[PDB]
Structure formats: C-alpha cells, structure tokens
C-alpha cells in the first residue's frame, strides 16, 4: 500500500508496482470530474484524433483524488511515469487497437538557482528562457569493449590498448547501451529580470527525447517540467553532466503575464 522503507525501493516492488498501476488504470476511467464529461475519455479521443501519443495529466487532479500517489510522483518520477505510460498505452489499444504521459501543474516551481542536489533525480517544474537549441540528434550510445587477452573491460566510450595489459587487439563489445533514441538538446537560463544584477544568470541543459522534440524555439520563455538527473554526456571515462529530462513544456504567452 504505502509507508514502506524507501520510496524508490517501495515502487520498485512488483506488488505495490502493479497495485499502483491498476489504481491508475481505474482512475483513467473513474475521473469524470465534477463536469462528468469523462476527462480521460476526452483526452484519449483528442490524442487518437491526431495520434500524438502525448497525454496531459494535471497534478492537482491526481493529488485531490489519490493524494498518496501524487505525493510519491516526485520521489519516484521514472517508475510512476513508466507505469502511467503503460496504462495509457493499454487504454488507447483497448479503445483504439507507445503512449507518453506528460505531467503539469506542479505545485512548487523552482528557479534555476533554486535547485540543488536535494532536487537531484526528481521531477521539478521551473521557468526559464531558451538560449540555444540543436537538431534532432539520432542517438547517444555507450560502448564498453571486452579486452582482447586480459580479464578487463574497457571503460565506457560515447558514440553517436588496455589500461593494464596494454593489449593491442581490437577488443569486442562487452556491452552497448542506447540512450536518447532521438533527442534535441536545449539550454535554458534564468529569465531576464529575475537575476540579482551582478550575479551571472544560471543556465541548465535540457534533453527532449521523442516527444516534445522541436517543441520550442530559441528565445522562448517556457515553463519546463522534467526530471533533474545526472547522466552521461558526449565527452578516460565519459563525464557525467547533470541535465533535465524534459517531461512537459509550455509557453508563457506575451512573455510577460
């Protein structure tokens, strides 16, 4: 149910994992809202009209209807996000034989200077101004090579002579992992006017994979919600650069409201 020992460990458990999955799937039908229009049915119909595989979920509704579930969303973002994605995919297939779920309306909004290690590997919403954006980079793959004639695996090598035995063999791929199967990299800095004069505006890097790709333009003030987590980067072993995995994006109309 709840109140385990660690939120990440608690969600990882298969029992509670399927419990939360079933509860969310049921909520995908029960939540007709006071309007009684079956909000989730409306969202499913809108998505399937254009087949956007992009679902919008309001944190307020989850918090009010469930409470505990919305409470656990911040601490275990990836797990519950995958649960919601699979639930939405199953619902869409049932109604219309992957679905990405994007959250919004996060209660607390933190500035770039306001986020620290306490917020690492958690979902958070911030307000920033885009500064630079790249193309739709194909993929970032980390390749680890089993050594040739030596019990050792060469360190991760990013893509997109042994340290001990000095073997000259070409080596063979011990393990290759793919990350960001199709991604766009953007940079967001503190919106002008919120900087404390002398202080240089803070900047952070966000990655938009598959969904939300090319959903922003340089120079656009956006309220970005995403998982602020560490991860590999394009650079001995690869450098671990902190980034924001973008879960949802918005636009602040008129740039001042």
């Amino acid at each position: 149910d709840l109140k385990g020992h660690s939120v990440r460990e608690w969600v990882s458990m298969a029992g509670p994992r399927l419990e939360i999955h079933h509860r969310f799937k049921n909520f995908l039908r029960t939540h007709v809202d006071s309007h009684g229009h079956n909000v989730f049915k409306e969202r499913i119909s809108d998505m399937c009209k254009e087949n956007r595989e992009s679902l919008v979920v309001n944190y307020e509704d989850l918090a009010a209807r469930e409470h505990v579930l919305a409470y656990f969303l911040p601490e275990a973002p990836a797990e519950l996000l995958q649960i919601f994605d699979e639930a939405a995919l199953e619902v869409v297939l049932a109604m219309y034989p992957h679905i990405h779920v994007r959250i919004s309306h996060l209660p607390l909004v933190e500035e770039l200077r306001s986020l620290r290690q306490l917020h690492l590997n958690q979902l958070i919403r911030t307000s920033g101004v885009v500064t630079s954006c790249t193309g739709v980079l194909p993929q970032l793959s980390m390749v680890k090579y089993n050594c040739n004639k030596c019990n050792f695996v060469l360190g991760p090598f990013c893509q997109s002579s042994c340290p001990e035995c000095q073997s000259a063999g070409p080596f063979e791929v011990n393990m290759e992992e793919t990350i960001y199967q199709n991604y766009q990299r953007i940079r967001i800095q503190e919106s002008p006017g919120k900087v404390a004069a002398g202080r240089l505006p803070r900047s952070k890097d966000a990655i938009l994979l598959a969904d939300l790709v090319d959903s922003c333009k340089p120079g656009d003030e956006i309220e970005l919600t995403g998982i602020y987590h560490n991860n590999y980067d394009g650079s001995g072993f690869p450098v671990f650069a902190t980034v924001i995995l973008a879960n949802h994006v918005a636009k602040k109309d008129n740039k001042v409201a």
């Binding site: 004639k149 030596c150 001990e164 035995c165 000095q166």
Partner: protein
Amino acid sequence: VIWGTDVNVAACKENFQRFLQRFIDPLYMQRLGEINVIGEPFLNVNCEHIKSFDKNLYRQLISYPQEVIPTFDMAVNEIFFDRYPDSILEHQIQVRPFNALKTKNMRNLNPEDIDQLITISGMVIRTSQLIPEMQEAFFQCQVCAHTTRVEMDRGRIAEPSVCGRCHTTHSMALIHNRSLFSDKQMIKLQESPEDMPAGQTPHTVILFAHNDLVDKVQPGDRVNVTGIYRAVPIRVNPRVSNVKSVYKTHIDVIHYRKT
C-alpha cells in the same frame, strides 16, 4: 664481511668516524654544529677528502655504495648523539658523498661501473613532477572491509586474492590514500657538450631522486650529479615475466653540486 666484498660494518664505521674527527683541510664537525641549529640533516662530504685521508676507504665506498653509505649514516648519527647529545630532529643525519670519480666521459661508460658511485657533469634537459611510489599498500575487503597491509613487496604489490576474516574470494581492493608513498622524481640529463672530444652523438642519462633531493635542479641547469649506477631489466610484455637480455640503465642520485 658482507658477501663478495671487503667491508666490515664495525671497522668501516670506525674508520669513517676517525675520518670525521681526524682531518685537516675538522670542517665536518663545523658543519655538524651548523646542522644542529639549521636542523638540515644532510652532511655533504667531498669524497676526494676521504681519498686523500684514506684511499682504501674511498675505494671501498665507490665499489659498494649501497652497502657502505648506511654505515656512514650510523656513524654520523652516533657522533651527533655524542656532540650535541640532546637535540630534536625528525630524522637522524644522513650523508651524501660527492665529487669522487670524475668518469665524466659518459659516452665512455662500462658495465663494470654497475652499482658503483660515480659523479658526472652535465646539463639537465627535462624533469617531471614528483611521482609518489608505494611502499606499504593498504587493502580493504569489498565484503567485510577486512583491513590488511603489504609492505615493500619488491616494487610490485602482491595482491592477496583472498580475504582473511571472511576468507572470501579475491575481493580486497587497494586504498590509495590509506597507503604509504615516497617521492621519486625522474630527470633526463644530457652530457656536457664541452667535455665530449668528438660530440658526434651527445649522450643522455636518466636520473631518479628518491625521498629527498627532489626538484633541486631546474631544467637547463649545469650540475655535477653523483649517484649509484643502476641497471634494471625490462620485461618484454608486462603480463609475462620474460625480460630482455639487455638491461636499461639509469642513475640513483646521491648528491647535486650546482656548477
């Protein structure tokens, strides 16, 4: 006597003490007193003084430096505990002889000089940052954190491959910071061009300064370096134990004289 030499620890120490006390240009006692206040525990001695005082002792020192220098160190420490018997020093005095055998014809050097003290004049070409070399490796078990130590494992470190409290499989990893290190600086020094008669191919040598005397010579400095000639094997492949029949040779410096 130590095997394959003409050296007696007691007699050699007594002769060195006599040389320290009975000598005429006594300077050694003067600089011993100077070290008292300075605290600098390094007694530099010109070997030519020993040669003049006792040629036999000079020959013995040159032939077997590694085995003889400790005796001189012990004698100097005993004297320092005799004169100024009360004093404080982090480590007892050390002796660093110099200017003994000017076989500065580096191009003309022979394997007969292996493990023999020699002084050579030349200009240092390159150096390197002080290298910390292990002397007492510290290991901790990944399973039970069983702490253990391996001391002076003849250069390499003997991996236990097995723990001692849980006696699990090879899981005890070395802890660099918890270990103990010593300073070793590498220098590449070129033979002095003037001394070479032909100079068709200027000669170069590699020097190692150990535990002290590090960074005391900047690049391009023309100095006389006195140290022990050394030859060490080179392994054909690090994995295999085979060694080349031809040894690469270097110098373990004992004293520097700026000139």
